[PDB]
Amino acid sequence: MNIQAIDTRHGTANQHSFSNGNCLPYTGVPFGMNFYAPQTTDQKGSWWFHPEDRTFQGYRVTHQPSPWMGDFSHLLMTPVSGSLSELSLFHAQSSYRPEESLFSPVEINLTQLRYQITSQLIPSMYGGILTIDYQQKDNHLLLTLPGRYQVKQLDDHQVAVKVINYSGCEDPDFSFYFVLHFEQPLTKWFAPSSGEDGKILLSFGNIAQQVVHFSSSFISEKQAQLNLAREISLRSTEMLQQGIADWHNYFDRLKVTHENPEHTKTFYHTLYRTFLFPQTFYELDENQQPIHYDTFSQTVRPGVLYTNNGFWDTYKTVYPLFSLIAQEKYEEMLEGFLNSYNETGFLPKWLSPDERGLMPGTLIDAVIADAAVKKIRPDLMPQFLEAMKKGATQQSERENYGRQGTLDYLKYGYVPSTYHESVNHTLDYAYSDFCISQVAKTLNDSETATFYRQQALNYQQLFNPETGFMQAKDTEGNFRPDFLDIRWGKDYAEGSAWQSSFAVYQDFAGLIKLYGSELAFEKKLIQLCNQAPNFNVEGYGFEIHEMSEMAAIDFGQLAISNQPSFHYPFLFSYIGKPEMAQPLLKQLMQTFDASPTGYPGDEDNGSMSAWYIFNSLGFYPVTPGAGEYVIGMPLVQTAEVKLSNGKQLTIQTSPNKVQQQFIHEIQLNQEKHTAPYFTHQELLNGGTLDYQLGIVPNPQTTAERPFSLSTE
Numbered sequence: 001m002n003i004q005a006i007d008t009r010h011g012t013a014n015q016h017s018f019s020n021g022n023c024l025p026y027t028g029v030p031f032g033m034n035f036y037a038p039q040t041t042d043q044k045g046s047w048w049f050h051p052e053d054r055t056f057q058g059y060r061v062t063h064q065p066s067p068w069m070g071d072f073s074h075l076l077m078t079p080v081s082g083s084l085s086e087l088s089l090f091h092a093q094s095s096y097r098p099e100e101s102l103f104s105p106v107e108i109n110l111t112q113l114r115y116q117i118t119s120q121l122i123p124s125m126y127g128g129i130l131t132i133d134y135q136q137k138d139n140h141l142l143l144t145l146p147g148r149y150q151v152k153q154l155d156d157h158q159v160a161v162k163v164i165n166y167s168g169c170e171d172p173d174f175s176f177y178f179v180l181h182f183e184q185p186l187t188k189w190f191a192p193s194s195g196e197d198g199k200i201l202l203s204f205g206n207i208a209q210q211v212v213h214f215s216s217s218f219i220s221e222k223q224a225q226l227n228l229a230r231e232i233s234l235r236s237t238e239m240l241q242q243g244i245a246d247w248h249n250y251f252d253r254l255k256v257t258h259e260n261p262e263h264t265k266t267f268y269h270t271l272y273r274t275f276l277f278p279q280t281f282y283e284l285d286e287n288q289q290p291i292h293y294d295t296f297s298q299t300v301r302p303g304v305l306y307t308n309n310g311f312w313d314t315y316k317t318v319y320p321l322f323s324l325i326a327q328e329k330y331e332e333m334l335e336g337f338l339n340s341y342n343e344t345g346f347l348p349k350w351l352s353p354d355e356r357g358l359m360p361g362t363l364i365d366a367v368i369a370d371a372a373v374k375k376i377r378p379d380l381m382p383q384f385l386e387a388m389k390k391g392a393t394q395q396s397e398r399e400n401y402g403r404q405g406t407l408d409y410l411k412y413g414y415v416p417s418t419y420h421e422s423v424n425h426t427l428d429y430a431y432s433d434f435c436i437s438q439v440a441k442t443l444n445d446s447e448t449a450t451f452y453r454q455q456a457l458n459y460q461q462l463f464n465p466e467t468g469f470m471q472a473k474d475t476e477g478n479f480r481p482d483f484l485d486i487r488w489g490k491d492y493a494e495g496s497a498w499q500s501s502f503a504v505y506q507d508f509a510g511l512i513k514l515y516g517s518e519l520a521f522e523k524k525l526i527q528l529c530n531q532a533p534n535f536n537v538e539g540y541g542f543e544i545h546e547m548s549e550m551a552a553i554d555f556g557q558l559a560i561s562n563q564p565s566f567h568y569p570f571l572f573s574y575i576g577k578p579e580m581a582q583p584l585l586k587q588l589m590q591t592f593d594a595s596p597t598g599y600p601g602d603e604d605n606g607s608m609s610a611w612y613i614f615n616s617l618g619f620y621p622v623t624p625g626a627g628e629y630v631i632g633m634p635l636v637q638t639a640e641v642k643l644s645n646g647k648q649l650t651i652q653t654s655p656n657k658v659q660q661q662f663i664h665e666i667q668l669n670q671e672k673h674t675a676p677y678f679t680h681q682e683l684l685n686g687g688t689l690d691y692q693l694g695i696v697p698n699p700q701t702t703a704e705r706p707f708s709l710s711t712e
């Protein structure tokens with residue numbers, strides 16, 4: 001699909017009570033430092049765009065990764081004609097016709113009906129071009145400068161802005177610089193000024209067209225001018241062509257077809273949302289050297305940096321996909337994450353722009369371990385191992401950094417029930433421990449590998465054989481009483497015991513053994529899938545959108561709306577019955593489409609999009625750090641995968657219509673493939689992956705299982 005046909009309102013029909021992706025209509029280049037979106041309202045907090053709104057407040061320069069994190073370093077540009085007494089966004093707002101507008105990754109185009117203005121925004125990595133066609137005779141641009149600001153007019157054609165605004169930041173004066181060069185001159189001079197919540201009306205007089213070339217920096221005004229100078233001569237058409245080529249660089253890596261072209265349209269909308277985050281958070285100085293802002297020291301520091309990622313989300317799918325098709329980005333992003341550790345003392349958890357904490361666990365450890373076992377940035381793994389061992393043995397004095405209950409986990413073999421969400425923290429630390437063991441192993445560090453492989457079995461501490469769930473346990477080894485399987489919160493993050501008891505990616509064979517047999521585990525998985533989607537709210541005291549998104553559909557406790565359930569269909573692969581889940585995977589993929597209601601829950605910065613992309617191809621990374629993809633059920637008929645190593649994997653299915661719900665046979669390079677997984681090395685060899693599909697199952701009788709520590 002051509003990037004210009006992607007409609008960025010995909011996944012944007014949201015509110016606090018219910019998510020269909022909690023996406024914004026992000027216009028930008030891949031991993032752009034800024035994104036650009038129309039703002040329709042200032043009365044709904046983080047939900048400042050809705051696709052059903054007919055009001056246009058301005059073009060918002062945004063860094064907002066999710067409505068839960070909020071924005072940082074934002075401002076707006078609003079074309080205006082005529083006089084305004086009052087310059088508030090509400091007083092300057094115009095209606096617009098969404099159905100006559102363009103909402104695409106490389107271009108916004110819309111008409112303000114109040115002003116008879118039609119305008120076009122094209123993005124670049126650090127800036128963009130805003131072209132403004134005025135019908136009226138007194139023409140302006142309104143800059144909305146939230147928080148503390150500075151603005152000045154440098155000459156007739158140049159304006160410089162600084163704004164300080166954020167939702168959370170270690171630097172209370174966190175500054176963003178924004179520079180505008182106008183083709184047509186300013187007709188009114190104003191003196192340098194500063195204040196809070198700026199409303200600056202720039203005047204151009206009677207011109208038919210203004211062309212605004214803009215750039216930005218987290219370094220300085222002078223760096224923002226250097227970023228602008230590098231692209232000032234571009235016409236809007238040339239910047240648009242370059243942005244189309246940037247997106248085609250990534251889209252061209254996965255050329256797919258389907259029986260149903262609606263499925264292809266869904267694929268490419270999720271692929272657009274897979275190359276946005278993490279956002280570039282470094283600039284190139286006068287010597288082309290990477291520099292960035294370090295909010296911990298409040299200084300400019302050398303090196304790459306990336307932002308807008310919660311590894312709790314993105315470790316699941318994003319970095320594994322990048323390990324196949326965007327290794328050059330993974331390489332640079334790992335360098336940035338290590339820089340975050342260098343600057344703060346702890347490997348990052350939730351960057352927006354700097355450490356926000358929020359979710360349980362230190363899942364950066366899986367991003368690191370997956371890279372180590374795939375030979376990505378082996379040069380950094382000794383530095384990563386030191387950072388990981390520090391996070392596993394030392395408690396940050398600051399609540400947002402590293403492990404919570406670090407020392408209690410080491411004393412007891414679990415985080416005790418007095419900690420919030422102790423089941424998640426326990427299971428995430430045991431999985432982290434596996435990840436640390438894998439990095440150690442790649443470095444031939446036997447003592448570290450042995451100790452952390454043993455720590456990785458700590459999931460066993462919270463398994464209650466009386467219930468068949470993971471439950472919180474106090475310091476005397478007693479399970480919290482009054483257990484209810486469907487009760488959300490308190491001991492579990494955004495789920496019940498059903499959404500939390502299977503986070504054992506390092507050792508499913510060992511978890512299965514705790515149930516007593518492959519058959520007792522099978523019965524538990526069947527009950528999870530086939531029951532009603534009932535929930536109890538008591539751990540929260542009210543219903544949250546994750547509950548509502550599970551209860552909106554009849555897929556039992558398999559809450560595909562949120563990350564904890566993403567791997568659930570693959571649990572059948574660990575008992576040698578993947579055929580039980582092949583229909584279920586195709587039916588789960590039908591919960592996605594390219595519409596404004598197109599995701600089953602929060603998309604989370606590529607996480608759910610890459611879930612869809614992997615499942616479309618028919619395999620999935622259940623265990624980052626194992627170097628394997630567990631086989632599912634493909635939705636494509638064809639795929640040409642351009643691998644980062646320069647080879648090509650060509651996928652071909654037999655006719656893949658709605659009645660094909662099973663895999664009959666797989667050939668990899670014309671050889672029968674019976675294992676319920678692929679190694680990373682097998683896929684990197686490239687060649688041909690042929691799926692013969694079925695309308696009935698074809699049970700394989702093989703003892704082969706995907707990776708588990710306890711059986712390796």
Ligand SMILES: CO[C@H]1O[C@H](CO)[C@@H](O)[C@H](O)[C@@H]1C
Pocket residue numbers: 068494544545546602
């Ligand atoms: C505070 O926001 C987080 O936590 C909330 C639960 O407290 C979620 O409903 C929401 O989706 C997000 C992950």
Ligand SMILES: [Ca+2]
Pocket residue numbers: 561562563602604
């Ligand atoms: Ca989520």
Ligand code: NA
Pocket residue numbers: 019020597598599600601
């Ligand atoms: Na939806």
